[PDB]
RNA sequence: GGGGAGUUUGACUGGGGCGGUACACCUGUCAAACGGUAACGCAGGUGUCCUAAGGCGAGCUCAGGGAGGACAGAAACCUC
């Protein structure tokens, strides 16, 4: 048997692009990201100052956004279609989440505009389960127990069964 | 305008002088489980800075570590 609603569902999908310098490149990356995600993304300032990468304290160097639900699985389907539903054993974290990256963006269904240029990005997905909001709600916060959490094997099974993908070793 | 006049040229202090400030303050210890308690005892700090680094209210949680993610690495950004 099974519990009808202890099943696995994706609860958020995070997209980010880290360009490493503020300016026209940054705002065009924000533009392509918001066109892809249908909503305005946000800028993240540099935490520290390191001159090896040519960055300083508190300038926007990356643009990221998060999605839930319908648009989340559509974007994830596009990304996995680009990655031909192929992932590696080490692509999955110990907490049940996973992710990957796309070297360039116009392949997943984005028209090439010569002005904006080309940009890669990182997809990440946080596998969830009904009741995970306990860990972050305000009134009576608590843990999510031991049985209810997600492990690497469960994430692998969910990926290979729902999206009929292949986990090549590596 | 030392030609001439009057006067002054601190204190502390293992003699005085040179050095130093133990000369006004602050922290720990000395200090002997109330408080107080000495030495040129020990380790140090002060003559500032702030329109917010003051005053309320709201919302968040930090250092670090582990596991993941294109360039990305020991270190850039995202997630748990
Ligand atoms: Mg005389
Ligand atoms: Mg006594």
UniProtKB/Swiss-Prot annotation:
There is a cross-link at residues 31, 45, 147 (Glycyl lysine isopeptide (Lys-Gly) (interchain with G-Cter in SUMO2)). Keywords: Acetylation, Cytoplasm, Isopeptide bond, Nucleus, Phosphoprotein, Ribonucleoprotein, Ribosomal protein, RNA-binding, rRNA-binding, Ubl conjugation. One of its GO terms (cellular component) is ribonucleoprotein complex. The keyword Phosphoprotein applies. It comes from the Eukaryota. The modification Phosphothreonine is found at residues 37, 40. The keyword Glycosyltransferase does not apply. It is found in: Nucleus, Nucleolus; Cytoplasm. Pfam families: Ribosomal_L5, Ribosomal_L5_C. One of its GO terms (biological process) is translation. Transmembrane segments: none annotated. Its main location: nucleus. GO terms for molecular function: rRNA binding; structural constituent of ribosome. InterPro entries: Ribosomal_uL5 (IPR002132), Ribosomal_uL5_C (IPR031309), Ribosomal_uL5_CS (IPR020929), Ribosomal_uL5_dom_sf (IPR022803), Ribosomal_uL5_N (IPR031310). The modification N6-acetyllysine is found at residues 45, 78. Component of the ribosome, a large ribonucleoprotein complex responsible for the synthesis of proteins in the cell. The small ribosomal subunit (SSU) binds messenger RNAs (mRNAs) and translates the encoded message by selecting cognate aminoacyl-transfer RNA (tRNA) molecules. The large subunit (LSU) contains the ribosomal catalytic site termed the peptidyl transferase center (PTC), which catalyzes the formation of peptide bonds, thereby polymerizing the amino acids delivered by tRNAs into a polypeptide chain. NCBIfam families: PRK04219.1. PANTHER family: 60S RIBOSOMAL PROTEIN L11-RELATED (PTHR11994). Belongs to the universal ribosomal protein uL5 family. Component of the large ribosomal subunit (LSU). Part of the 5S RNP complex, which is a LSU subcomplex composed of the 5S RNA, RPL5 and RPL11. Component of a hexameric 5S RNP precursor complex, composed of 5S RNA, RRS1, RPF2/BXDC1, RPL5, RPL11 and HEATR3; this complex acts as a precursor for ribosome assembly. Interacts with PML. Interacts with MDM2 (via its RanBP2-type zinc finger domain); negatively regulates MDM2-mediated TP53 ubiquitination and degradation. Interacts with NOP53; retains RPL11 into the nucleolus. This is Large ribosomal subunit protein uL5. It comes from Oryctolagus cuniculus (Rabbit).
């Amino acid at each position: 048997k099974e519990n009808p609603m202890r099943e696995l569902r994706i609860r958020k999908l995070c997209l980010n692009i880290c360009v490493g310098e503020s300016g026209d490149r940054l705002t065009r990356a924000a533009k392509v990201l918001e066109q892809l995600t249908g909503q305005t993304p946000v800028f993240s300032k540099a935490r520290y100052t390191v001159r090896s990468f040519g960055i300083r304290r508190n300038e926007k160097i990356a643009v990221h956004c998060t999605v839930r639900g319908a648009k989340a699985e559509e974007i994830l389907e596009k990304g996995l279609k680009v990655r031909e539903y192929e992932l590696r054993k080490n692509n999955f974290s110990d907490t049940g989440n996973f992710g990957f990256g796309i070297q360039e963006h116009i392949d997943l269904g984005i028209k090439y505009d010569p002005s904006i240029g080309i940009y890669g990005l990182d997809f990440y997905v946080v596998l969830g389960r009904p009741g995970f909001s306990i860990a972050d709600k305000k009134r009576r916060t608590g843990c999510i127990g031991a049985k209810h959490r997600i492990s690497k094997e469960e994430a692998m099974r969910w990926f290979q069964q729902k999206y009929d993908g292949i986990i090549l070793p590596g």
